[PDB]
Amino acid sequence: SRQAEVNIGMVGHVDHGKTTLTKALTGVWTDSEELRRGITIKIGFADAEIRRCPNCGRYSTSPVCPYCGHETEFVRRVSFIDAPGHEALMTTMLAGASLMDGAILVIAANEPCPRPQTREHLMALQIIGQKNIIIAQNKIELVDKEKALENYRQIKEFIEGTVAENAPIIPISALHGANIDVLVKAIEDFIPTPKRDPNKPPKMLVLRSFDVNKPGEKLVGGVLGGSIVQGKLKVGDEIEIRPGVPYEEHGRIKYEPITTEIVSLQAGGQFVEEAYPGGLVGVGTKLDPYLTKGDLMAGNVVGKPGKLPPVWDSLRLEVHLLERVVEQELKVEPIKRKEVLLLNVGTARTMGLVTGLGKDEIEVKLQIPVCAEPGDRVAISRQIGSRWRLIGYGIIKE
Numbered sequence: 001s002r003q004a005e006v007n008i009g010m011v012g013h014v015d016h017g018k019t020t021l022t023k024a025l026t027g028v029w030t031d032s033e034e035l036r037r038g039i040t041i042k043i044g045f046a047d048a049e050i051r052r053c054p055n056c057g058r059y060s061t062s063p064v065c066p067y068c069g070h071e072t073e074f075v076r077r078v079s080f081i082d083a084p085g086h087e088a089l090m091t092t093m094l095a096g097a098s099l100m101d102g103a104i105l106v107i108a109a110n111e112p113c114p115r116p117q118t119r120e121h122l123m124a125l126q127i128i129g130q131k132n133i134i135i136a137q138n139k140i141e142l143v144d145k146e147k148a149l150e151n152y153r154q155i156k157e158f159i160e161g162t163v164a165e166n167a168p169i170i171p172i173s174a175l176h177g178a179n180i181d182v183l184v185k186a187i188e189d190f191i192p193t194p195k196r197d198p199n200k201p202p203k204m205l206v207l208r209s210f211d212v213n214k215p216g217e218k219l220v221g222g223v224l225g226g227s228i229v230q231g232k233l234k235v236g237d238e239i240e241i242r243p244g245v246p247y248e249e250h251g252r253i254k255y256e257p258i259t260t261e262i263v264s265l266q267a268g269g270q271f272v273e274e275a276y277p278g279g280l281v282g283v284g285t286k287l288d289p290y291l292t293k294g295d296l297m298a299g300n301v302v303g304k305p306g307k308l309p310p311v312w313d314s315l316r317l318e319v320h321l322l323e324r325v326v327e328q329e330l331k332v333e334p335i336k337r338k339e340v341l342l343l344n345v346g347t348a349r350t351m352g353l354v355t356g357l358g359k360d361e362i363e364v365k366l367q368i369p370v371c372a373e374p375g376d377r378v379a380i381s382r383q384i385g386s387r388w389r390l391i392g393y394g395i396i397k398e
């Protein structure tokens with residue numbers, strides 16, 4: 001209903017203005033929000049209600065027109081995905097393209113076009129085939145007219161031949177809220193709500209799981225927080241969760257898919273009877289809180305019984321390594337047998353042991369099983385020194 005209809009990724013080089021623009025659009029100038037941010041994926045969702053003024057016709061994200069003061073009309077709710085660092089957003093796009101319906105590429109007008117990070121974010125969009133792009137030429141008030149036009153030409157040159165070739169370039173000042181109405185209008189024109197088939201099997205990627213019952217009769221079942229990427233969820237629905245609950249058998253860890261029932265659904269800031277793709281959805285269940293407490297189910301996948309992707313203990317991956325540009329160490333060394341990698345697929349995260357090599361392929365034994373479909377994309381990271389670094393992605397093969 002009134003919940004977010006699309007997730008918009010905020011991309012661009014660090015310091016160019018992604019967070020400032022997100023706050024300008026969501027109207028957040030205070031405050032924490034650090035409770036709906038992912039754990040397996042360093043992601044945060046922030047909703048905004050796009051509205052249009054009947055009087056002057058300009059778009060904004062406020063019930064009160066910033067331009068004439070008139071009350072605006074509701075158009076659509078959207079959600080912006082803004083992440084802390086470069087590495088984070090990159091991993092997020094490669095592992096969960098199903099989480100983004102479009103993207104706003106922020107490029108600071110007072111910076112040398114182009115910079116490595118910007119190049120890598122566009123490379124990520126290219127890989128996942130995300131073409132609903134809008135470019136925000138930020139900090140426009142910091143440059144003169146000549147430099148502004150020149151920067152525009154460089155961006156244009158830069159996007160030619162890419163998934164962003166058809167993107168509009170909108171000059172703005174995210175900090176001062178300049179020309180924001182033109183950008184909001186562009187979100188409606190270039191990031192339309194996709195025509196989704198509401199009857200495809202439902203599938204939600206669990207981002208978080210909690211026990212809402214307070215410190216110290218509403219001993220409420222466990223709650224799952226996540227993204228619906230296909231179909232829809234409805235109160236009363238019977239759902240299965242995979243891989244499920246860990247248990248020990250003969251000294252080793254196994255996982256038992258678990259079935260429960262949806263008792264409540266929160267989306268757009270309120271309880272609803274049905275939830276769909278777009279923004280975060282809080283799923284209240286009948287599960288024993290002890291099972292969801294402390295994000296024990298983060299990374300799991302939710303769907304209707306008998307209609308979930310398979311669970312894998314090991315993966316055969318068609319590997320595509322990145323031609324890395326963002327401290328030297330650009331050259332990505334080939335993956336060797338016995339190497340331990342970090343894999344991200346959907347909202348799931350697990351280390352993996354390379355057990356075999358093939359033509360543009362690797363076999364990997366997973367530390368923690370994952371629920372995914374053949375063909376799904378997996379972000380691959382290698383430990384460089386003391387930190388994990390993204391080096392490419394793999395496609396699950398049977």
Ligand SMILES: Nc1nc2c(ncn2[C@@H]2O[C@H](COP(=O)(O)OP(=O)(O)O)[C@@H](O)[C@H]2O)c(=O)[nH]1
Binds near residue numbers: 013019021172175176
């Ligand atoms: N002058 C000016 N500074 C801006 C503008 N937009 C963002 N900034 C500033 O530039 C810095 C980087 O912005 P931030 O939003 O944190 O962007 P991020 O690092 O891409 O996510 C902050 O100090 C902002 O206040 C703008 O339009 N004009």
Ligand SMILES: [Mg+2]
Binds near residue numbers: 018084
């Ligand atoms: Mg930021």
Ligand SMILES: [Zn+2]
Binds near residue numbers: 053055065066070
């Ligand atoms: Zn108005």
